[PDB]
C-alpha cells in the first residue's frame with residue numbers, strides 16, 4: 001500500500017468519509033419527520049459509497065494501468081464508480097429541496113450519467129488525442145447541469161419557503177464552484193496532459209470530494225429546510 | 232478509424248444522433264408545462280446516450296474481439312450499453328402516455344433489462360451453440376414486452392384523451408415493427424449465423440436506431456398528447 | 463458442463479427458478495387490482511433474473527478464475543449480478559407491504575447496494591487477507607438492513623391492516639433467517655476460508671436462493687395483503 005506516494009491522501013480520504021458517514025448516521029437517529037428522513041438517507045449514503053471506493057483505491061483494487069503516450073499510466077477507475085452513484089444523489093438533494101418537477105430531475109440525472117460515463121470512457125481510452133474528445137463531451141454535460149441549477153432551480157427556490165431558498169442558494173453556490181474544479185484537475189492531471197503529478201492530483205480530488213460530500217452534507221443537515229413546516 | 236469498412240455507417244449514425252439530440256434540446260427550450268417537460272427530458276436523453284455510444288464505436292472503444300467458430304469475431308459491445316438505458320426510456324415514453332400503473336411499468340422495464348442483458352451475454356458467449364440459447368431467452372422477453380404493449384396498453388389508451396389514444400397507437404405500431412427487426416438482424420449478422428457481413432449489419436442497425444429514436448421522437452414531440460389538458 | 467461437480471446444483475437451481483418464474487407469471491394473469499399488480503411484477507421478476515444467472519453459471523459464462531492463496535480459485539461472479547438486482551426487489555416487496563416512507567426505502571436499497579457491491583469486490587480481491595475486510599463491511603451493511611426491518615418496519619406494520627401485519631411478520635422472519643446464512647456460507651466456502659468445498663457451497667446457495675425467492679414469493683402471492691381493501 002505504502003509503495004504508492006499518493007497512499008497518504010487515499011488513507012486520509014477513507015478516514016474522513018468513514019467519519020462523515022458515522023456522524024450523519026448518528027445524527028439522523030433522532031429523526032421521524034418523513035421529509036427529513038429523505039434528506040438524511042440521501043446524504044448519509046453519499047459518503048458511505050465514497051468510503052468504500054476510497055478504500056478500494058487504498059488497497060489497490062480500484063486502480064488499473066492504461067497504455068497511452070507510450071507509457072503504462074496508473075488510472076484510478078474507482079472514482080467513476082463512486083461518482084456514478086454519488087453525483088446523482090447530490091443532485092437529488094438539491095432537486096428535492098426546491099420540489100423540482102419530475103422531468104427536470106430526469107434531465108439532471110441523465111445528463112449527470114452522461115457526464116460520468118463519458119469521463120470514464122475518456123479515462124480508459126488508449127488513443128491519447130481521443131481522451132480529450134470525451135473530456136469535452138463530459139464537460140458539455142456538466143455545463144448543462146450547471147445551467148439548470150441556475151436558470152431552472154434558483155427561480156424555483158424563490159417561490160418556496162425562505163429557509164429552503166436560502167439553504168438552496170448556499171448549496172447551489174458550493175456545488176457550482178466545487179464541481180467545476182473536477183474537469184480542470186482531470187485535464188492537467190495524470191488522466192489528461194500530465195502536468196500535475198498523480199500524488200498532487202490525488203490530494204486535490206480528496207479535498208474536493210470531502211468538501212463536496214461531507215462539507216455539503218454538514219450545511220444541508222443543519223438546516224431547518226429539510227423539515228416539513230410543522231407546528 | 233477508416234480501417235473498418237463499417238466506419239461510414241458509424242459516422243453517419245453519430246451525426247444523426249447528434250443532430251437529433253440538438254434539435255430536441257432546442258425544441259424543448261420553450262416548454263413550461265410539467266407533463267411536456269417529462270416527455271422532452273426522456274425523449275432528448277435517448278439520442279444523447281445513443282450519440283455517445285455511436286461515437287465510442289466509431290473511435291474503436293466500443294468494440295471487442297470474441298473467439299467463436301475458430302475465429303476472432305468483432306463484436307460491438309457498446310450497442311448493449313446504449314440499449315440498456317435507451318430502450319427502457321423509450322418504453323417509459325409509451326407508458327407515461329397512457330398513464331400506466333406502476334406494476335406494469337416495472338414489469339416492462341424489468342423484462343426489457345432481461346432482454347438486453349441476455350442479448351449481451353449471448354453476444355459475448357464463446358461457445359457458438361450457446362449464443363442462440365441466449366438469443367431465444369432474450370426474444371422471449373421481447374415477446375412479453377410486445378404482448379403487454381398490445382393487450383395491456385392499447386385498451387388503456389382508449390379510455391384516455393383521443394389525442395393520446397391516437398398518438399399512442401401510432402408510436403406502438405412504430406415500436407413493434409422496428410423493435411422486432413433487431414433480433415432478426417442479430418441472428419443473421421456477425422453475432423449469430425454470420426450470413427450478412429458486419430458492414431451491412433451496421434447499416435441495418437443504424438437505420439433501425441435512427442428510426443426508433445429520432446423518428447419516434449419526432450412523432451411524439453409534435454403531438455399535443457404530451458401536454459396536460461389546459462385552457 | 464458436467465466437467466464441474468457442482469453442475470448438478472446449478473442445473474437444479476436453473477430448473478427451479480425457471481419453474482417458479484412460469485408459475486408466478488401464470489398466477490398473475492388473472493389480476494387487475496393495481497396494488498396486486500405491483501407485487502406480482504416485483505415478485506415474478508426476482509426468479510426470472512435468478513433463472514438467467516443460474517443458467518449463465520451452468521453454461522460456464524458466469525465463472526471466472528481469481529488468483530489468491532497461490533491458487534487459481536473458481537469464483538462464480540454471476541451470483542452478484544443476480545443479487546444486485548434481486549435483493550433490492552425483495553426489500554421493495556417488504557417495504558411496499560408496510561407502506562414505507564421514501565427515505566427509508568432509499569436507505570434500504572442503498573445499504574443493499576453497498577452490501578452486494580462490497581461482496582463482489584471481496585470475491586474478486588487478490589490479496590487474501592483483504593477479502594475479509596470487504597466481507598466485514600458488507601456484513602455491517604447487512605446488519606443495518608436487518609436492524610431497519612425490525613426497528614423501523616415491524617412497528618410500522620402494526621398500525622396497518624391485520625392481514626398485512628401478519629404477512630409482513632412472516633416474510634420478515636423468513637428474510638432475516640435466510641439472508642443471515644449467506645455471509646456464513648461465503649466465509650467458510652471457496653470465497654473465504656475454503657473449509658467447505660465448492661460443490662457443497664453451491665448446493666447451500668441453491669437451497670437458500672430457492673427458499674428466499676420462490677419460497678418467499680409463494681407466501682407473499684397467496685396472501686390477501688397484496689390486494690387493496692375493496693368490497
Ligand SMILES: CC(C)CCC[C@@H](C)CCC[C@@H](C)CCC[C@@H](C)CCOC[C@@H](CO)OCC[C@H](C)CCC[C@H](C)CCC[C@H](C)CCCC(C)C
Pocket residue numbers: 084109110113114115117118120121124280283294295308311312313315316351
Ligand atoms: C440515464 C443515465 C444512467 C444515462 C447513462 C449515460 C451513459 C449511457 C453514458 C455512457 C455509459 C457507458 C460509457 C458505460 C461504459 C462502461 C464501460 C467503461 C465499462 C468498462 O468496459 C470498457 C472496456 C475496457 O475499457 O471493456 C472491455 C470490453 C468488455 C467486453 C466490455 C463488455 C461489458 C460492457 C461494459 C457491458 C455494458 C454494461 C453497461 C455499460 C453498464 C453501465 C456501467 C456504468 C459505468 C454506466
Ligand SMILES: CC(C)CCC[C@@H](C)CCC[C@@H](C)CCC[C@@H](C)CCOC[C@@H](CO)OCC[C@H](C)CCC[C@H](C)CCC[C@H](C)CCCC(C)C
Pocket residue numbers: 315340341344345346348349351352355511514525526539542543544546547582
Ligand atoms: C430490473 C432489471 C434491471 C433487471 C436486469 C436484468 C439482468 C439481470 C439481465 C442479466 C444482466 C447480466 C447479464 C449483466 C452481465 C454483465 C456482463 C456481461 C458484463 C461483462 O462481464 C462478462 C465477462 C466477460 O464476458 O466478464 C469477465 C469476468 C469479470 C470478472 C466479471 C466481474 C464483474 C461483473 C460483471 C459484475 C456484475 C455487475 C452487474 C452485472 C452490472 C450489470 C451491468 C448491466 C449490463 C446489466
Ligand SMILES: CC(C)CCC[C@@H](C)CCC[C@@H](C)CCC[C@@H](C)CCOC[C@@H](CO)OCC[C@H](C)CCC[C@H](C)CCC[C@H](C)CCCC(C)C
Pocket residue numbers: 049052063064077080081082084085120546571572575576577579580582583586
Ligand atoms: C445506490 C446504490 C446503488 C449504491 C451502490 C453501492 C456501490 C457503490 C457499492 C460498490 C459498487 C462497486 C464496488 C462496483 C464495482 C464493480 C466492479 C467489481 C466491476 C468489475 O471490475 C473490477 C476489476 C476487476 O476485478 O475491473 C478491472 C478494471 C476495469 C478497467 C474496470 C473499469 C470499469 C469499471 C467497473 C466501471 C465502474 C462502473 C460501475 C462500478 C458500475 C456498477 C456495477 C455494479 C456492480 C454496482
Ligand SMILES: *C/C=C(C)/C=C/C=C(C)/C=C/C1=C(C)CCCC1(C)C
Pocket residue numbers: 083086087090115116119120135136138139142179180182183186209212213
Ligand atoms: C463527490 C464527487 C463529486 C461531486 C464529483 C464530481 C465530478 C465531476 C463534476 C466530474 C466532471 C468531469 C468532467 C466534467 C469532464 C472530465 C472528467 C470528469 C469526470 C472529471
Ligand SMILES: *C/C=C(C)/C=C/C=C(C)/C=C/C1=C(C)CCCC1(C)C
Pocket residue numbers: 314317318321346347350351366367369370373410411413414417440443444
Ligand atoms: C434504440 C435502440 C433500440 C430500440 C433497440 C432495440 C433492440 C432490441 C429490441 C433487441 C432485441 C434483441 C433480441 C430480442 C434477441 C437478440 C439480441 C437483441 C438484443 C438484438
Ligand SMILES: *C/C=C(C)/C=C/C=C(C)/C=C/C1=C(C)CCCC1(C)C
Pocket residue numbers: 545548549552577578581582597598600601604641642644645648671674675
Ligand atoms: C436471492 C438472493 C439473496 C436473497 C441473497 C442474499 C445475499 C446476501 C444477504 C449476501 C450477503 C453477503 C454478506 C453480508 C457479506 C459476504 C458476502 C455476501 C455478499 C454473501
Ligand SMILES: CCCCCCCCCCCCCCC
Pocket residue numbers: 181184185195196197200
Ligand atoms: C482548480 C485547481 C487546479 C490548480 C492546481 C494547482 C496545483 C499546484 C501544485 C503545483 C504543481 C506541481 C508541479 C510540480 C510537480
Ligand SMILES: CCCCCCCCCCCCCCC
Pocket residue numbers: 412415416426427428431
Ligand atoms: C429485417 C431485415 C433483415 C433482412 C436484411 C436483408 C439484407 C440484404 C442484404 C444482402 C445480403 C448480403 C449478402 C451478400 C454479402
Ligand SMILES: CCCCCCCCCCCCCCC
Pocket residue numbers: 643646647657658659662
Ligand atoms: C449456515 C450453514 C453453514 C453450515 C454448513 C454446514 C455444511 C456441512 C457439510 C460438511 C462440510 C464438508 C467438509 C468435508 C468436505
Ligand SMILES: CCCCCCCCCCCCCC
Pocket residue numbers: 084085088089092102105106109113
Ligand atoms: C447510472 C446510475 C443512475 C442511478 C443513480 C441513483 C440515483 C437515482 C436517483 C433517482 C432520482 C429519481 C428520478 C425520478
Ligand SMILES: CCCCCCCCCCCCCC
Pocket residue numbers: 315316319320323333336337340344
Ligand atoms: C438496468 C438499467 C435500468 C434503468 C434504466 C433507466 C430507466 C428507468 C426508468 C424507471 C421507470 C420508473 C419505474 C417506476
Ligand SMILES: CCCCCCCCCCCCCC
Pocket residue numbers: 546547550551554564567568571575
Ligand atoms: C444498483 C441497482 C439498484 C437498483 C435495483 C433495482 C431496484 C430499485 C428499486 C427502487 C425502489 C424505489 C425507490 C424510490
Ligand SMILES: CCCCCCCCCCCCC
Pocket residue numbers: 139143146147150180183184
Ligand atoms: C453556462 C451555465 C452558467 C453557469 C455555469 C458556469 C460555468 C463554469 C465553467 C466551469 C469550468 C469547466 C471547465
Ligand SMILES: CCCCCCCCCCCCC
Pocket residue numbers: 370374377378381411414415
Ligand atoms: C405475442 C404478442 C403479439 C404481438 C407481438 C408480435 C410478435 C412479432 C414477432 C417478432 C419476431 C421476433 C423474432
Ligand SMILES: CCCCCCCCCCCCC
Pocket residue numbers: 601605608609612642645646
Ligand atoms: C442488529 C439487528 C438485530 C437483528 C439482526 C440480527 C443479526 C443476525 C446476525 C447475522 C449473522 C451474520 C454474520
Ligand SMILES: CCCCCCCCCCC
Pocket residue numbers: 128129132133136
Ligand atoms: C493530443 C491533443 C490533441 C488535441 C485534442 C483536443 C480536442 C478537444 C476537443 C474540444 C472540442
